[PDB]
Design an enzyme around this catalytic site. Structure first.
Site, PDB file in Angstrom:
ATOM      1  N   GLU A 111       0.828  -1.198   0.000  1.00 22.78           N
ATOM      2  CA  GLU A 111       0.000   0.000   0.000  1.00 22.78           C
ATOM      3  C   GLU A 111       0.868   1.256   0.000  1.00 22.78           C
ATOM      4  O   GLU A 111       2.004   1.255   0.478  1.00 22.78           O
ATOM      5  CB  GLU A 111      -0.921  -0.006   1.225  1.00 22.78           C
ATOM      6  CG  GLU A 111      -1.922   1.143   1.302  1.00 22.78           C
ATOM      7  CD  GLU A 111      -2.798   1.244   0.066  1.00 22.78           C
ATOM      8  OE1 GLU A 111      -2.410   1.952  -0.886  1.00 22.78           O
ATOM      9  OE2 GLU A 111      -3.873   0.610   0.045  1.00 22.78           O
ATOM     10  N   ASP A 150      -2.237  -5.206   0.649  1.00 19.43           N
ATOM     11  CA  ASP A 150      -1.558  -4.139   1.376  1.00 19.43           C
ATOM     12  C   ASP A 150      -0.175  -4.527   1.875  1.00 19.43           C
ATOM     13  O   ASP A 150       0.711  -3.669   1.940  1.00 19.43           O
ATOM     14  CB  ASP A 150      -2.394  -3.667   2.571  1.00 19.43           C
ATOM     15  CG  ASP A 150      -3.667  -2.976   2.152  1.00 19.43           C
ATOM     16  OD1 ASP A 150      -4.748  -3.586   2.276  1.00 19.43           O
ATOM     17  OD2 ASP A 150      -3.573  -1.838   1.640  1.00 19.43           O
ATOM     18  N   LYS A 171     -15.037  -7.785   2.308  1.00 24.59           N
ATOM     19  CA  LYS A 171     -13.692  -8.010   1.787  1.00 24.59           C
ATOM     20  C   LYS A 171     -13.512  -9.457   1.346  1.00 24.59           C
ATOM     21  O   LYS A 171     -12.949  -9.723   0.278  1.00 24.59           O
ATOM     22  CB  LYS A 171     -12.648  -7.641   2.842  1.00 24.59           C
ATOM     23  CG  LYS A 171     -12.576  -6.158   3.179  1.00 24.59           C
ATOM     24  CD  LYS A 171     -11.749  -5.393   2.157  1.00 24.59           C
ATOM     25  CE  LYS A 171     -11.259  -4.073   2.728  1.00 24.59           C
ATOM     26  NZ  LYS A 171     -11.103  -3.033   1.678  1.00 24.59           N
TER      27      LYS A 171
HETATM   28  C1  LIG Z   1     -10.707   2.390   3.592  1.00 27.20           C
HETATM   29  C2  LIG Z   1     -11.295   3.412   2.629  1.00 27.20           C
HETATM   30  C3  LIG Z   1     -10.497   4.703   2.697  1.00 27.20           C
HETATM   31  O1  LIG Z   1     -12.632   3.664   3.121  1.00 27.20           O
HETATM   32  C4  LIG Z   1     -13.377   4.703   2.609  1.00 27.20           C
HETATM   33  C5  LIG Z   1     -14.029   5.493   3.542  1.00 27.20           C
HETATM   34  C6  LIG Z   1     -14.801   6.566   3.132  1.00 27.20           C
HETATM   35  C7  LIG Z   1     -14.913   6.842   1.791  1.00 27.20           C
HETATM   36 CL1  LIG Z   1     -15.885   8.193   1.279  1.00 27.20          CL
HETATM   37  C8  LIG Z   1     -14.272   6.072   0.850  1.00 27.20           C
HETATM   38  C9  LIG Z   1     -13.497   5.000   1.257  1.00 27.20           C
HETATM   39  C10 LIG Z   1     -11.201   2.899   1.208  1.00 27.20           C
HETATM   40  O2  LIG Z   1     -10.458   3.469   0.415  1.00 27.20           O
HETATM   41  N1  LIG Z   1     -11.917   1.832   0.812  1.00 27.20           N
HETATM   42  C11 LIG Z   1     -13.132   1.239   1.391  1.00 27.20           C
HETATM   43  C12 LIG Z   1     -13.159  -0.136   0.768  1.00 27.20           C
HETATM   44  C13 LIG Z   1     -12.645   0.149  -0.634  1.00 27.20           C
HETATM   45  C14 LIG Z   1     -11.446   1.074  -0.362  1.00 27.20           C
HETATM   46  C15 LIG Z   1     -10.129   0.385  -0.074  1.00 27.20           C
HETATM   47  N2  LIG Z   1      -9.202   0.403  -1.033  1.00 27.20           N
HETATM   48  C16 LIG Z   1      -8.019  -0.188  -0.814  1.00 27.20           C
HETATM   49  C17 LIG Z   1      -7.011  -0.134  -1.945  1.00 27.20           C
HETATM   50  O3  LIG Z   1      -5.948  -0.766  -1.802  1.00 27.20           O
HETATM   51  O4  LIG Z   1      -7.318   0.536  -2.943  1.00 27.20           O
HETATM   52  C18 LIG Z   1      -7.729  -0.817   0.358  1.00 27.20           C
HETATM   53  O5  LIG Z   1      -6.558  -1.421   0.611  1.00 27.20           O
HETATM   54  C19 LIG Z   1      -8.675  -0.852   1.379  1.00 27.20           C
HETATM   55  O6  LIG Z   1      -8.487  -1.403   2.474  1.00 27.20           O
HETATM   56  N3  LIG Z   1      -9.880  -0.231   1.125  1.00 27.20           N
HETATM   57 MN   LIG Z   2      -6.611  -2.292   2.762  1.00 25.64          MN
HETATM   58 MN   LIG Z   3      -4.688  -1.484  -0.244  1.00 23.36          MN
END
Ligand SMILES: CC(C)(Oc1ccc(Cl)cc1)C(=O)N1CCC[C@@H]1c1nc(C(=O)O)c(O)c(=O)[nH]1
Ligand SMILES: [Mn+2]
Ligand SMILES: [Mn+2]
Length: 183
Positions: free
Chosen positions: A61, A89, A115
């Site tokens: 990450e 990550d 997840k």
């Molecule tokens: C955790 C986070 C920031 O929550 C939010 C909260 C509020 C809003 Cl408005 C938008 C997102 C997120 O970005 N999220 C929520 C689940 C999808 C995404 C995520 N992406 C990755 C990646 O690697 O791209 C991860 O590793 C991962 O743990 N989560």
């Molecule tokens: Mn993550």
């Molecule tokens: Mn990630």
């Protein structure tokens, strides 16, 4: 909220989060809840690697996604681990498995279920933390020792409390549900 992020987070994490949002066409000054959520998730990933030895984890990450896939490929070619369908990550060099870190303002087991269905890989370890001091990991294997995870839960609880003192918490909690609803 933007004032809180730069106050409570290391400026490198802030710049990483700003760099990430700009590459995806999002304004950190407008999408303030996502800004704080990216910073929080990044910090947990950094605190997670501190819980192991200096040989233990590879942090995936927070790096350029295209380059992060080359290291994922190099790891899979070297170790024989099955390649994940989504960028994880961390990679655990001791357990020889990738790790997905979840940080949520919802319930931990509901977030784990989402997840687990989305990752749908098997052998990719999932570890979820909440801002209420709760955690959930795949098959009750929490990877880190108790003191390392206590530092993460305390940090998240600390962030929640100081957001709660600025009246920012309730908007932060509801934003993840709003993001989850839009589909
Ligand atoms: C955790 C986070 C920031 O929550 C939010 C909260 C509020 C809003 Cl408005 C938008 C997102 C997120 O970005 N999220 C929520 C689940 C999808 C995404 C995520 N992406 C990755 C990646 O690697 O791209 C991860 O590793 C991962 O743990 N989560
Ligand atoms: Mn993550
Ligand atoms: Mn990630």
């Amino acid at each position: 909220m933007e004032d809180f992020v730069r106050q409570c987070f290391n400026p490198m994490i802030v710049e990483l989060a700003e760099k990430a949002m700009k590459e995806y066409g999002e304004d950190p000054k407008i999408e303030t809840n996502k800004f704080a959520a990216i910073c929080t998730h990044l910090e947990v990933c950094f605190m997670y690697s501190d819980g192991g030895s200096k040989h233990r984890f590879e942090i995936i990450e927070g790096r350029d996604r295209i380059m992060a896939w080359t290291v994922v490929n190099s790891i899979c070619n070297t170790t024989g681990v099955e390649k994940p369908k989504f960028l994880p990550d961390l990679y655990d060099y001791k357990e020889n498995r990738f790790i997905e870190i979840g940080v949520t303002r919802r319930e931990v087991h509901i977030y784990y279920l989402e997840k687990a269905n989305k990752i749908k890989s098997e052998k990719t370890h999932i570890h979820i933390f909440s801002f209420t001091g709760e955690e959930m990991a795949t098959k009750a294997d929490y990877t880190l020792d108790e003191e390392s995870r206590a530092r993460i839960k305390t940090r998240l609880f600390t962030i929640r409390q100081e957001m709660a003192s600025r009246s920012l918490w309730d908007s932060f909690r509801q934003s993840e549900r709003a993001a989850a609803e839009l589909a």
